[PDB]
Structures are given as structure tokens and as C-alpha cells.
């Protein structure tokens, strides 16, 4: 929902849209993607706009982006949920504690989810900063 982001994602909608017709057309996604880095292809690019029946109006852009971001638990829940393991309130968690947790208990992570989860994670001094990782995840 948040207005802050309605106000940002409309700005982003202005660049993705290259030809100004007001609808993200496939040829714009290619054009901005060439203009940013290595483009996706057709397999992909066709498939992106086949996630929105009907014309990619700015309003359809908002929709799909929030019928995908809207599931997720909020900020303070994904942190109260890590502090359960952090009994002394040091707002960090030992890297092999959290890895043992995530990898082996509950609905275990597999080695790849594992590898991806810690590719960009906060670690320093053997400590995993979950207030930061949570901001990032979120």
C-alpha cells in the first residue's frame, strides 16, 4: 500500500516506460534493460508481461508489484522472531547458531538457499546482524 512507495514506483514506471505511450510495452523493457545492463531475452521478456493480462498501465504496474510484496511479515515481526534466539538482547546472532537453525531445524534450508541467504548477509566478528539482515530481507 504505502504512499511513499506509490510515489517512487510511479517514478520508476517513468523510466521502464521508455516510449512515453504510458503502457509498459515489451520493446521498452528491452530498451531500458539494454540501457541498464545485460538484457534478459524473449523467454524472459515475453514472460514478464504475461504476468499482467491487459495493458501494462501504471495501475497494473502497482498491482502486480504488491500482489507479490504483500504476504510477508512486517519489520518488527521478523526481528522479534530472531530475538527469541538472542536472549541477552545483543542485537546480533552467532553465525553458526543461525546457520544451524536455518539449515537443520524446522523446515530446513538446503545448501543453495543457504548459499544465497548468506551471499549478502551482515557478518562481522563471527556475529550476524539480524536487525540489518532483516531491514535488507524486508
Amino acid at each position: 500500500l504505502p504512499q511513499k512507495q506509490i510515489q517512487e514506483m510511479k517514478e520508476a514506471f517513468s523510466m521502464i516506460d521508455v516510449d512515453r505511450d504510458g503502457f509498459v510495452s515489451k520493446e521498452d523493457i528491452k530498451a531500458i534493460s539494454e540501457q541498464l545492463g545485460r538484457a534478459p531475452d524473449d523467454k524472459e521478456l515475453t514472460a514478464m508481461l504475461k504476468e499482467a493480462p491487459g495493458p501494462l498501465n501504471f495501475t497494473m504496474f502497482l498491482s502486480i508489484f504488491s500482489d507479490k510484496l504483500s504476504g510477508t511479515d512486517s519489520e518488527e515481526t521478523i526481528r522479534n522472531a530472531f530475538a527469541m534466539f538472542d536472549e541477552q538482547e545483543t542485537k546480533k546472532l552467532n553465525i553458526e547458531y543461525i546457520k544451524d537453525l536455518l539449515e537443520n531445524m524446522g523446515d530446513n534450508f538446503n545448501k543453495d538457499e543457504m548459499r544465497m541467504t548468506f551471499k549478502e548477509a551482515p557478518v562481522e566478528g563471527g556475529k550476524f546482524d539480524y536487525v540489518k539482515f532483516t531491514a535488507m530481507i524486508k
Binding site: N104, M105, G106, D107, N108
Partner: protein, 149 residues
């Protein structure tokens, strides 16, 4: 059994999770599963079969927990009388005191010994207001331990 079949169900998904939720819990934790349900054993659960020194060997599904709970359920739990004639023994002096030292020696040196770290912890909350003499009151300790947590 319908002591609580739908409650063993719950205690079991809970320990199922903590060793990977895949519909099965390690037989090493079968003991501990039954404790969350209101029962107390050891020698006994090893006979309804559970890992005898290890995490890793067998892992049991729901249907296989169901008779092991049944079989433990009417096993042997002691009483207040037992606890207090047992704890008399160590009362040299006749006022209901067993010293500090004497109490965690008779809990870790005997019976079905408890680790010297399970005995710092049971003394958490309970209160175990030790005397100046370093004596405790074994009656209290018996009562408090007895009142569940």
C-alpha cells in the same frame, strides 16, 4: 488410549519441527516427548525403546509413538512418602536438612544420575534458599519439584 491422543499429536509435531519437519521425531527424544504430556521414566523408555546413548540411530513416526506413550503411561512414578523416607537417610541431625553438598551428591552420584548441570538448573526456580549453615530443607525441594514446574 484417549488419555490425550490429539495432544501427543501436538507434542510430536513440535519435536518433529526441531529435528526437521518431515513427519518423524528421533527416538532419542521419545522420552522427552512423554514428559511434556505429564509422565516420568528413563530405564522404562529405554524399554519402550529409544536411542541408548544417541541421537541419530532410530527416528519414529506418529503411529509408533502412540503405543510407547501407552506403555509408559502407567509406569512408575513415586510419591511424597517415598521421597521423604529416601531423603530422611541423609538427615544426620533430625531437623529436615540435607546440606548443599550432600544434596547434589545424592542426585548425581546415585540412582539414575543427573548431570551436575541439571542440578544447578533444577535449583533455578524452585528458590533454594540455602541456610547460613549451607543446609536446605529437603521437604520443600520435594514439594516444589513435585508441583510440575
Amino acid at each position: 488410549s484417549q488419555d490425550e491422543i490429539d495432544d501427543l499429536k501436538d507434542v510430536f509435531e513440535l519435536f518433529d519441527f526441531w529435528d526437521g519437519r518431515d513427519g518423524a521425531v528421533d527416538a532419542f527424544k521419545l522420552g522427552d516427548v512423554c514428559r511434556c504430556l505429564g509422565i516420568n521414566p528413563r530405564n522404562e523408555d529405554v524399554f519402550a525403546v529409544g536411542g541408548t546413548h544417541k541421537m541419530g540411530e532410530k527416528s519414529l513416526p506418529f503411529e509408533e509413538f502412540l503405543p510407547a506413550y501407552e506403555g509408559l503411561m502407567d509406569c512408575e512414578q513415586g510419591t511424597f512418602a517415598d521421597y521423604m523416607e529416601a531423603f530422611k537417610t541423609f538427615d544426620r541431625e533430625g531437623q529436615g536438612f540435607i546440606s548443599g553438598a550432600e544434596l547434589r551428591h545424592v542426585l548425581t552420584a546415585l540412582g539414575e544420575r543427573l548431570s551436575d548441570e541439571d542440578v544447578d538448573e533444577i535449583i533455578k526456580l524452585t528458590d533454594l534458599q540455602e541456610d547460613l549453615e549451607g543446609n536446605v530443607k529437603y521437604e520443600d525441594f520435594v514439594k516444589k519439584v513435585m508441583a510440575g514446574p
